[PDB]
Amino acid sequence: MMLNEVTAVPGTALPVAEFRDHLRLGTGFADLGAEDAALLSYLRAAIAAIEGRTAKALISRGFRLALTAWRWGDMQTLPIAPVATVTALRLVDAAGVETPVAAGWRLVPDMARPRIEALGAMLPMIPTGGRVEIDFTAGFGASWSALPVDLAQAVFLLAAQYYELRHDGAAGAMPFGVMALIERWRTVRVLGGRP
Amino acid sequence: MMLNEVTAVPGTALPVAEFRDHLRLGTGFAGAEDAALLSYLRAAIAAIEGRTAKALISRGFRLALTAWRWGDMQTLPIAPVATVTALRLVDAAGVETPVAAGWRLVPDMARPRIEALGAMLPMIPTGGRVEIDFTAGFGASWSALPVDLAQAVFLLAAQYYELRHDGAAAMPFGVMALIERWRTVRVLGGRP
Amino acid sequence: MMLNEVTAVPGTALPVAEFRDHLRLGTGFAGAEDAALLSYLRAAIAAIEGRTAKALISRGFRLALTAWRWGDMQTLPIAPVATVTALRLVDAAGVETPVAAGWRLVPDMARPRIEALGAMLPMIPTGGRVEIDFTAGFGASWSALPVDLAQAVFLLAAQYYELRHDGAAAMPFGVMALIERWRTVRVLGGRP
Amino acid sequence: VALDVHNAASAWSKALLDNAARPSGAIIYKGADGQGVLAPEQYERLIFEMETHHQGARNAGRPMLLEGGLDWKPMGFSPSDMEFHETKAAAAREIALAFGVPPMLIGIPGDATYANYAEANRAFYRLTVLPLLTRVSAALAWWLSGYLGAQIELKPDLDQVPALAVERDQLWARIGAAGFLSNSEKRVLLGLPPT
Amino acid sequence: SVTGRIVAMASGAGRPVWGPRDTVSLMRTGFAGNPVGFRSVKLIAEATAAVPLICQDAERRYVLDLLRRPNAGQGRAELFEALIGQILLSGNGYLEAVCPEPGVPRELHVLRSDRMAVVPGADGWPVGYDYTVGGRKHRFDMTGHPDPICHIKSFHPTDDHYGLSPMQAAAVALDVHNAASAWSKALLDNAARPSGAIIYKGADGQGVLAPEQYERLIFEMETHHQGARNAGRPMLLEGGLDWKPMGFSPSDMEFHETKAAAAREIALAFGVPPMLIGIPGDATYANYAEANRAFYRLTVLPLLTRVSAALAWWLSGYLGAQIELKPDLDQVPALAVERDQLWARIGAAGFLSNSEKRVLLGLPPT
Amino acid sequence: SVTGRIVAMASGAGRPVWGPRDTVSLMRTGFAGNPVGFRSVKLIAEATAAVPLICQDAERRYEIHPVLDLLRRPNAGQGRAELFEALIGQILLSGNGYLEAVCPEPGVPRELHVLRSDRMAVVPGADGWPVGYDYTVGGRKHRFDMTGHPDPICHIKSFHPTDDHYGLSPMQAAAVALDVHNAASAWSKALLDNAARPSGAIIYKGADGQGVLAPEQYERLIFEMETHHQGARNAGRPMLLEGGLDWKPMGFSPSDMEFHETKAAAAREIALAFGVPPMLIGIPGDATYANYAEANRAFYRLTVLPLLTRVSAALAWWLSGYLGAQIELKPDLDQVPALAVERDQLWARIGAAGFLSNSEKRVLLGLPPT
């Protein structure tokens, strides 16, 4: 289970023109763009910080789940939570020659546990010495205006502290701080066991 | 179980004019444009409708779930509900056939629940999970809210405005003490 | 078990130009030459690739070990692996004969492990310990890293720059809170 | 209800032996920070001095030098025996109480209600066997007799059944020792053909 | 029989009904896996093979040369130790007979049951049996009178073709007894107790000690402070060093009473009393003369009178006269406490004559 | 026999089947490893060799029989008691008993050799009968041939419900309980040999947080500790501790009983598999049997006489193929000394039952009539 992404966020979809207005930088100057390589450099470092604490995706890029053995009998939970329209389930063998399979797999969409849920009582069988690549586009929406706004506010509260202090300097968190906004987007799991 | 909403709230229904009268009026200076303020109220509505499981502007939802909990139940999570629109019951591909009888919406702030008539509830096909579109929330405007819940939005959106990053600064009826009576109090972590 | 790397990272692959844009840009003064900055990023990459057992620039390693752990295993320590080059199997003096079949690399961020086909793995001669050369890491450039791991390098290399000796000064997503999800979580201190 | 307690309290122990984690201890490595993992050269070194020198029956009591940072916190297993043990045996006895066997007959441990198997096996063929068999044979006496004109009466013997011997002893010892009446008068009391 | 036409077409006519899937995974884990399930079967199978048999229905107690020597291999007792060893394990006993002669067949072979399955057919009784080893079948036939397989069943209330086999009833207590003995086996093999720990914090919060110091610390720990010959050396702890002695608080009795209760609910299902095999616990029976008498009356003589009655019918299809064949329940040494109180009862009954008490004990009058 | 062709070709005809994979290892760590598995075999193997035999063919007159002349001394340097204890000592250990017979004269073979069942393997053959046995010592076969009438090896099997060719050997059934008893005894052997209890510790911190004591101070500290404060003769010296010093007394918190109740319970399951009662070999525990007239009578009836009556039943059939007339060997069940309480209540019942005559009760007790 590798879970690398196919494409990344293009950078034009990040609200640098709004994160600049959040930082209270400056309005009517002839410069107005001296931090576009910087304000975008901390938005990518605060989205990807919250994607690791909440296991969310927030921009709906395309992923690829390359694994070698199905975890359970039929369900196969996906790590990244908000999923939609699994593009292709291919079933590779020992060397290349991938053959796509409709495969009777169906993707229950749920932000609790995004899983595949085989409908023929078994997931399609993996060849000996072969992988399985699930190609899917997981995330909230294609633009920034489709995010849940409490999660998008935690990105601005966090990327503004990477801006306003560069090295690791210690800073009482506010009622709904950074941690209190993402703590209803985290994954609440209580299974450390064999099944 | 996904529960995405149908349409977002327009912003012309949010009180960006009444927020600056909370923010700097009576005491202060008669600062930022409407797009900066409106980014902070819906960032404070979505922080309180997540902590209290409410809706506050009464937009339309779609709850699409794959298995009912009981056969006379499936409580709905977003709390103030009114007028469940349709109970669509798709098959696999989905020619998308709705049903129009068998259940009664019970409007209740405690457990907004769907409670089918008798003992049998509409079953689900193999693969064709059932979706519910309902319009949950207090009122279409902002003047239909409970005022203590509407004040804690203003007390929180003035916090997101007047201090930008996660910095330093509890009052008797604060933000937490006002939304502590709109939160869902449940003590079942069990099987049913 | 030694695990020395084949070639070090060149420095032209390290972002000495993008580090000073983190370090003094936007807020500050438009200080030190590139040889002073580059001595602090690789001193911060090697502090995080040791705490999280990662590689981050994808250089080539050589793992030379004397006994396999299981016969269907020997997990590799450096975590993001891709394209195990060769499984050389030297004898004593070592005419250095490679093998080319029997095992499958399983690319996995959890346990990058070598998992031979069937139940038998290539055995080791007396004295002729087996070496594995593999190329572990995220990407050849710096733009292929996870950005939270690349930010915690910049948050740490700006600490080694802006304060020289072990002096005085925790923020929510700090250096430790960003690399706490790339570290290896193991709870076997046992026999197998 | 008592079958469901005995089936589940036996599956409690079957499960508890099969999916439960006791460790014999834990070797805490915090480090110079509050949190620190140990290096992969350090981790193979830590296992090899733990696998070879400190585990097994042959290594019970090695004095275990713990340098700075390390600590060995020994764990326990605080309910060891007796997981629903007295509510399973009490549920085992109510199963034996419903069908009507005495618990010494099938082998349930507990208090000796009956004494010495000449009582309990005599209480078994009188409270739950011979009342059951005398009405199965009473339905066979009436259903079969409808197939042959003459009426038939089937009933159990209560003679040369081997658990009613202590009942048959005190019948033969009472009438055998009561020598006031004649021999042909005590054959008909015991059920013998007169001579 | 009239209901034969309706249960066989629903079960599937002319096909092999396999039945239990775990009929062999319980044998290797419940008979070669734990000693209680091992002993309880071998206690009964060696006992039912020990009780002699008598030939009634001939009008005088006399095929007895067939049972005492069935074949070239297993002996009389070896035959019944294998036959009852299948009924106690899988609920089904099978008996091949080869008959080149028309009557009284030459050899009896205990066909093992886990490689054996029935086929119901069109009506009533099974039409054939399939001995499937590897991929190869045999398909015996029952469409005739001599019927080359006797099929002895234990009682099964829901199935129409097999037995229930008390090992299946005690399948949880076998797994509790196997794992609790594997709990203690593992815990002796992978568990670190230390006798203590010498903690070297140092001047800092942390500090390792140099290899010149560590070889010194081993030598004074090996030579002076370990062993039976060194119990109590007063261990000068310098500045910084400290000896924190560890314990091992659950020492005895890891699943000890759950294993002994599991070891007795294995003995409860097969029918042996716990005194015979050696289970510790309370004294239910007193003095083994009533524990052995309870064994040969509750679970041996009910078991052998159902096997010997099925030998009595199936062998009487080969010779013309119908034979009866039941255990003797006399000259068996466990029923002697049953027998002597019978001989004391009518023996002291002095009213009836001498020819009238020989007929009560089974003695020929003279 | 009709089913013989499909069961023989499944495992592979004409090639050796090796059987169990660890019966050669359980002899080293379950019979020479622990006393309970050692004693349980030697108690049964030396009891089945003690019981006499009866040679009978329809008149029972054969007390001068050549088989009883054969079994009295089988071969040079191994008596009757040393033969059966070596034969039963293979049945209880690996589930298989073997007897070579060498015969120059074609009847009644001269010597019986207990071939050990570690190095023997079967050949399943054509018709479901093992054609050969291979005695494999080193890397060398022997291949006895049983395609004849005498068939030079009797193969005494215990009951095995899964295998077609070997037995189960109660040591193999208690192999988990042998590993608990071997390891919980090595727990205590190790704990006495590598464990550190100190009777105390003399803490010297010093003026700092940390300070060692000088070498003039260290010889002074030992000399007042060696001479005045250790030993049995110095139990209670009031021990003036000046500034810096401190005596922190250590303990040893589990002292007795390291896996003590799980070793004795594992000792009893070893005794439960072979079938001895625990009062016979000497395991402490609850007295199930009462007074050794019961337990020794339960020993020769549950695990000795069922074992010996089938070893002698294979000797009755294998030997009789060497001499025309069929032979029946069975144990005596008379003047075996543990069945005396069985023999008392037989003689007290028929002795006191004076309603029948004397010549009618001699045949009930088994006496020659007069």
Numbering used by the authors:
A (entry chain D): 1 to 171, 174 to 197
B (entry chain C), C (entry chain C): 1 to 30, 33 to 171, 175 to 197
D (entry chain A): 199 to 393
E (entry chain B): 24 to 85, 90 to 393
F (entry chain A): 24 to 393
What does the paper say about this structure?
The genes encoding proteins that form Rhodobacter capsulatus GTA particles (RcGTA) are derived from phage DNA, which has been integrated into the bacterial genome. Here, we use cryo-electron microscopy (cryo-EM) to determine the structures of RcGTA before and after DNA ejection, and to visualize the interactions of RcGTA with R. capsulatus cells. Particles of RcGTA have heads with a diameter of 38-nm and 49-nm long tails.
The dodecamer of the adaptor proteins provides the binding site for a hexamer of stopper proteins, resulting in a symmetry mismatch between the two complexes. Adaptor loops from two neighboring adaptor proteins differ in their conformations and interact with one subunit of stopper protein. At the distal interface, the long and insertion loops and C-terminus of the stopper protein bind to a terminator protein. However, the long loop of the RcGTA stopper protein interacts with the tail terminator protein and does not block the central tail channel. A hexamer of tail terminator proteins (Rcc01690, g8) binds to the distal interface of the stopper proteins. Unlike other tail proteins of RcGTA, the tail terminator protein contains α-helices 1 and 2 in its N-terminus.
